RNA sequence: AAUUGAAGAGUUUGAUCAUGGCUCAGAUUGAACGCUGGCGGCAGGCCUAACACAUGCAAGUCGAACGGUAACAGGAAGAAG
């Protein structure tokens, strides 16, 4: 019931004294399938150590999302660095139809059938960060009615 | 009951993030070309030279408008084997 999946692995470099030194970065997202989404970055010298650090950071640093029946509630826009992201609840608008690196976080998030369209930059490290910010500041009808009295 | 509706990716760098262009994945067509080709249904078929046109048809009808008889088939009368 953990439901982990990796989005992006890259080879970064460092350029020391004698030549270059190549390191690998993972970027994974875990989530239970009912709210509870996390992402982790993690970087290491080989690929399986990188994904393992990424999963291990992603299992902690996990955020609650106030889902609807199987989906979002109201249309929400989350931004991070250069990466602006729209989402629309699509009240059984079948299938998760999101961009790459947004399909994954929305998939393990437990949502099933939203409409997305990322704008701006679509770097995978910042398009999540713009989905969680997004799903984090999406509030439910029992939270809005809690705030404003009824 | 009559709008249930939105996906990205590759490429600037030793690597990064951003900006930014180029390019790809889709659908479409009065299409052409290449390879191949069994049947049917429904549609479509000179986008260019509003260039030049052989030949055949594409606008005739009415005698219940009229003088009339060129034919065709009868009618009447005459003459002949």
Swiss-Prot record:
Annotated Gene Ontology cellular component terms: cytoplasm; cytosol; cytosolic small ribosomal subunit
Alphabetical keyword list: Acetylation, Antibiotic resistance, Ribonucleoprotein, Ribosomal protein, RNA-binding, rRNA-binding
Signal peptide start-end: none
Outcome following mutation: residue 13 to P: In strain: SPCR13 and SPCR15; spectinomycin resistant. Not a ram mutation
Domain S5 DRBM stretches: 2-65
GO molecular function annotation: rRNA binding; structural constituent of ribosome
Alphabetical GO biological process terms: cytoplasmic translation; maintenance of translational fidelity; response to antibiotic; ribosomal small subunit assembly; translation
Pfam families referenced in this protein's UniProt entry, alphabetically: Ribosomal_S5 (PF00333), Ribosomal_S5_C (PF03719)
Entry-linked InterPro entries: Ribosomal_Su5_D2-typ_SF, Ribosomal_uS5, Ribosomal_uS5_bac-type, Ribosomal_uS5_C, Ribosomal_uS5_N, Ribosomal_uS5_N_CS, Ribsml_uS5_D2-typ_fold_subgr
Domain of life: Bacteria
Primary role: With uS4 and uS12 plays an important role in translational accuracy. Many suppressors of streptomycin-dependent mutants of protein uS12 are found in this protein, some but not all of which decrease translational accuracy (ram, ribosomal ambiguity mutations). Located at the back of the 30S subunit body where it stabilizes the conformation of the head with respect to the body.
UniProt family annotation: Belongs to the universal ribosomal protein uS5 family.
Oligomer and partners: Part of the 30S ribosomal subunit. Contacts proteins uS4 and uS8. With proteins uS4 and uS5 encircles the mRNA as it enters the ribosome, which may play a role in mRNA helicase processivity. Can be cross-linked to mRNA. In collided ribosomes contacts ribosome rescue factor SmrB.
Comment text on domains: The N-terminal domain interacts with the head of the 30S subunit; the C-terminal domain interacts with the body and contacts protein uS4. The interaction surface between uS4 and uS5 is involved in control of translational fidelity.
Other comments on record: Altered uS5 proteins have been identified in a number of mutants. Some mutations in uS5 have been shown to increase translational error frequencies. Some mutants in this protein can partially suppress an alanyl-tRNA synthetase mutant.
Protein name: Small ribosomal subunit protein uS5
Protein source organism: Escherichia coli (strain K12)
Lineage start: Bacteria, Pseudomonadati, Pseudomonadota, Gammaproteobacteria, Enterobacterales
């Amino acid at each position: 019931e953990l439901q982990e999946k990796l989005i992006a692995v890259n080879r970064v470099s460092k350029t020391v004294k004698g030549g270059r030194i190549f390191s690998f970065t993972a970027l994974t997202v875990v989530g239970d399938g009912n709210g509870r989404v996390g992402f982790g970055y993690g970087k290491a010298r080989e690929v399986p150590a990188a994904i393992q650090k990424a999963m291990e950071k992603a299992r902690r640093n996990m955020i609650n999302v106030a889902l609807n029946n199987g989906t979002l509630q109201h249309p929400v826009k989350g931004v991070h660095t250069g990466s602006r992201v729209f989402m629309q609840p699509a009240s059984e608008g079948t299938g998760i139809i999101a961009g790459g690196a947004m399909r994954a976080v929305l998939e393990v998030a437990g949502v099933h059938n939203v409409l997305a369209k990322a704008y701006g930059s679509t770097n995978p490290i910042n398009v999540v960060r713009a989905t969680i910010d997004g799903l984090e500041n999406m509030n439910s009808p029992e939270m809005v009615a809690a705030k404003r009295g009824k």
